[PDB]
Structures are given as structure tokens and as C-alpha cells.
């Protein structure tokens, strides 16, 4: 889309400097069997099906990202939260930035119960809504600085009848692959749930959750070759 340097999955994640106008097309070619991000914060992509997100997006003739945040992340259940940024995610005005599709609900510090959030269908009448979410996990001593828990955290999401589970990882992190290149201590896991027209999504989470802000609104069908 006349934008530079930024891969297809990179735009699919809402990485800063890759917000941009998305045109519609009735035919699309598929050129990445393994979509790769060269930018935003290091991700353990194979933990989930997140690699197939942009190739799923091109299957829709008309695709657009939500103009407003699906939810406001600061007042979510679990105490007031700051909105996260990072140096591995350079915002052209600030040495720090993050995905526009998600938010880092980092507490202002005690163990917490599993928290439940419904996700609205704020997209228009018929366009399928892909909701992108994830969770962060760092090593033991920084999980203590960040959260009130060094134990593995529990996560699970449910929408359209698809109910998944997750559990974070502490320590022994794989090297930093497909990111902004700056040495970090933690890692990121990203997943997405699709919401049919009218229906809601649910996410059960603990400390370390990445709450969603910008959700995809996709409609139409585009031929794929």
C-alpha cells in the first residue's frame, strides 16, 4: 500500500508505522507460506496459529481495521492498567511504541484470580471480525517486578464455539527472532479469534495479558492464487 519496509503480517498486527489505508481487491496472490515480521516485539509465533492471520485477511475482498478501540484497556478488571510501549517498536514520534491492535495491561502488585472479558462485535452488520490478542511472559525475577506472580499464568479465549487454553512460559526463552532486534528479557505469544456478525468473544486471563484495542472488520471474498 505504498508503505515501506513493513511485511504483510507486520501490517496484520497493527505495528506502528504500518497503520495505513487498506484497499480492497477481488483477486489476491499468496506469496508467503510463512509470513514473517521484521519489526515489532519478539514473538513466539508457532505457539499459536498467528502465522496464518494475514493470509486469512487477504481472503476477504474488503478488509479494514477498526477506527476506535474495541475496549478501553485502562479500566479493565484487575485494577488500573498502564498502556504499554517498547523500544523494539519505534514510534516515529517516540522511541517507544506498540501494536495498535493490542494493549499491555500491566498492573500498577498482588496475585489475582482469573478475569473474564467479553468482546463486542463493534464492526458493521455483516463483516466478520477478527479479534487479535495475546500474552507476555518474562523470566522469574522480572515477572516479580512486573506482576505479582512468578508462576505460569492461565489464559483461555472462546468465541464462535472455539474454546482454547494457554499457559505462559518462565525462563529459558528462545532467541529473539523476527523482531526489532533489541535485546529483551521476555517474550510474546499472539493469537486471534474470529467473531461472526453479531456475536461476542470471551477471554479469560491472568497477569501478563495483552488486551485488544483495534480489531479487524473483514468482508467480501477475494480469489486467492
Amino acid at each position: 500500500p505504498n508503505c515501506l519496509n513493513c511485511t504483510d503480517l507486520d501490517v496484520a498486527l497493527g505495528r506502528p508505522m504500518c497503520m495505513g489505508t487498506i484497499p480492497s481487491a477481488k483477486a489476491s496472490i499468496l506469496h508467503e507460506v510463512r509470513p514473517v515480521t521484521s519489526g515489532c516485539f519478539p514473538i513466539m509465533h508457532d505457539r499459536t496459529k498467528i502465522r496464518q492471520l494475514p493470509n486469512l485477511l487477504r481472503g476477504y475482498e474488503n478488509i479494514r481495521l477498526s477506527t476506535h478501540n474495541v475496549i478501553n484497556a485502562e479500566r479493565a478488571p484487575g485494577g488500573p492498567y498502564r498502556l504499554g510501549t517498547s523500544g523494539s517498536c519505534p514510534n516515529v514520534t517516540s522511541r517507544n511504541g506498540f501494536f495498535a491492535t493490542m494493549a499491555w495491561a500491566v498492573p500498577r502488585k498482588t496475585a489475582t484470580n482469573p478475569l473474564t472479558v467479553e468482546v463486542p462485535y463493534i464492526c458493521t452488520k455483516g463483516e466478520d471480525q477478527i479479534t487479535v490478542w495475546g500474552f507476555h511472559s518474562d523470566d522469574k525475577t522480572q515477572m516479580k517486578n512486573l506482576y505479582g506472580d512468578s508462576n505460569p499464568q492461565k489464559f483461555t479465549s472462546s468465541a464462535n464455539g472455539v474454546t482454547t487454553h494457554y499457559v505462559s512460559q518462565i525462563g529459558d526463552f528462545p532467541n529473539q527472532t523476527e523482531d526489532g532486534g533489541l535485546p529483551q528479557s521476555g517474550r510474546i505469544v499472539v493469537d486471534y479469534m474470529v467473531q461472526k456478525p453479531g456475536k461476542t468473544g470471551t477471554i479469560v486471563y491472568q497477569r501478563g495479558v495483552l488486551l485488544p484495542q483495534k480489531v479487524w472488520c473483514a468482508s467480501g471474498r477475494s480469489k486467492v492464487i
Partner: antibody
Amino acid sequence: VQLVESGGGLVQPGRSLRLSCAASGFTFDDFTMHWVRQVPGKGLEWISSINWKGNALDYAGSVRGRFAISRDNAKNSLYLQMNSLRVEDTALYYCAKDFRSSSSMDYFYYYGMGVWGQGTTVIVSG
Amino acid sequence: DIQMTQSPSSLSASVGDRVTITCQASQDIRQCLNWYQQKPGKPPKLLIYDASTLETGVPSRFSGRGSGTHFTFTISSLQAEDVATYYCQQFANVPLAFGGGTKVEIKR
């Protein structure tokens, strides 16, 4: 906005001491905090910088391994635990607020230091 | 590490003169520089941040310019209460470096 440094005085070389920076007038847990010393006659020297959490700690080489920065967002106090003191740690230690409420959480949370205190005098001598 | 070669070392000028202070960097910081003024025996007040923008309350005769490795601080019309030791400071790298300082005094 106020920043008050306290706890500086006369100490032996090699012993321990701790300064306290009592903040008031702004949301202390949103900003990153700094430490800058100025030995009398010379200029400003950066000591350490802690972010709005206690998760990230940066130290200048001369103090790395000997000093320790920390903060209490409830009692809005910035701390600096200096250990194995040297006579060239003798300086006027300033407490500084970073203007930007940057929740960087990785790097670059330090910016223009808008607000400074009046400092506390530390003289390491036997 | 980035060394702040601030210049001059000490100057003097009559009231109304144009005062200029340059700060070089050994490596590119590109905006992350800012200027402080030393009220004698008193705190540092921030005048210029991000090397060109002007802080709340500080007068119009103070200006900063520069990018990359060269930065310029200028007082358009020197006043008597400007007697101070001014300091530049880069915050582009995790270690922070302050310039050597420049002593400003009035020629009367």
C-alpha cells in the same frame, strides 16, 4: 512539584548510606526517576535512572555493582543505596523527575529532566 | 559511550549581546538533547528540550537548534540574570552524558 533530597552527610570510604527523595505534587508512579551528582566545582554527572516501575534499572559504569536504585510508588519516594563508597563519590546528589510519562518498559524511558531538587551534600572522608 | 563536547568553556558578553553555545556529540542522537541552566548554588531549570522546543515560562530570547551530532544553543539578547553555568545532555543512549558546562558572565 517538589523534590526533596535527604540522608547525605559524612561517611567512611567503603561503608554504606542511603538517600531518600520524597516526592509530592504529581503522580509519582507514572514517571521515571533520575539521580545526578555534582562534585563541588565540576559539572553534572548522571548516576542512575529507574522507570515508573522497579523493573528496569540503569547504572553508570563508575557506580555499577556498588549503588542500587529503587522506589516506592505508595510513599512516592526515590531511593539510592550506595555501597563500597569511594572518596570520589563525594558530590552533591540531585533528584530529578523525567518530564515524559513514558511507559517504555524496555529502553528510552529517560528524557528531558524537568524538575530537580535542591540536593543533599555527601562527603566521603575519614 | 557518547561524549558531550560542549563549547565554549567560559564566555563573557555585555548586556544585550548574542550568546551562543555549541554541543557536539561523538555519535548520532538526532533529537535527544536538551539544555539546562545553573542558577548559582541553586537547582537546574530546564530551558530547551528535544534541542529546539522551548519550556513553559522560559523567555523567548533562548533558542536551541541542531540535529545529528551538532547542536546550537543561543541567547538572542544577553541579560544580567542569565549569569549561570549551562549544561547540555543527551538521552538517546541508555548511559546519559552531560556536557562539560559553560560559565556565563556579564561584561559591564
